[PDB]
Copies of this chain bind each other. A is one copy, B any other.
Amino acid sequence: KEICLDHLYRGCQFHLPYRWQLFILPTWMDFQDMEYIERAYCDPQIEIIVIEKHRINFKKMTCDSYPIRRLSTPSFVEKTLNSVFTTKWLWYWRNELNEYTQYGHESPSHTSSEINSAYLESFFHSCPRGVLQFHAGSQNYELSFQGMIQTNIASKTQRHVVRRPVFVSSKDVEQ
């Protein structure tokens, strides 16, 4: 496990000090002309640059409305640890009993998403500004990480999303 940090010190999964990429679900793809993008970015007056008719917006960190990132090159290598010390994040949604159901688990109406906590944490880690589509029972939904809502794409009703860890006690650690 090797990580680098993006422009806001976020942990991410090179011959220049910088790597410019845009997120077209499912992948972060390299820009061509990385040195030219960087030169524009190093000028604080510049918010808009267009290369190949792709409109980059440094204020929103978007290109044609897709998220972009600047990876800093310096790499960090994970220290070998017991997996009991790794945080697992669980994702929940506010159900019709106004209680929390874990994603991939059955609702009070015996409906479940295919997506689960592992799926959502992986996506959230890679792309926090990600809006994504998913199915549950007979319905289609849109999940926004930024708003922490899911929305039925037909009825437009929103439900609240929450992200909290699996509890690991000091007893669990010794065990």
Residues of B within 8 A of A8 (CB): 10, 128
Inter-chain CA distance A160–B75, complex, in Å, is: 32
Contact B173 A17 (CB under 8 A): yes
Inter-chain CA distance A73–B38, complex, in Å, is: 33
For chain A, the count of residues having a C-beta within 8 Å of the partner chain is 48
Cβ < 8 Å to B, chain A residues 69-128: 72-79, 81, 84-87, 90, 92, 99-100, 125, 128
Selected from B17, B72, B167, B170, the residue in CB contact (under 8 A) with A15 is B170
Residues of B within 8 A of A74 (CB): 78-79, 81, 85-86
Asked whether A50 is an interface residue with its Cβ less than 8 Å from the other chain, the reply is: no
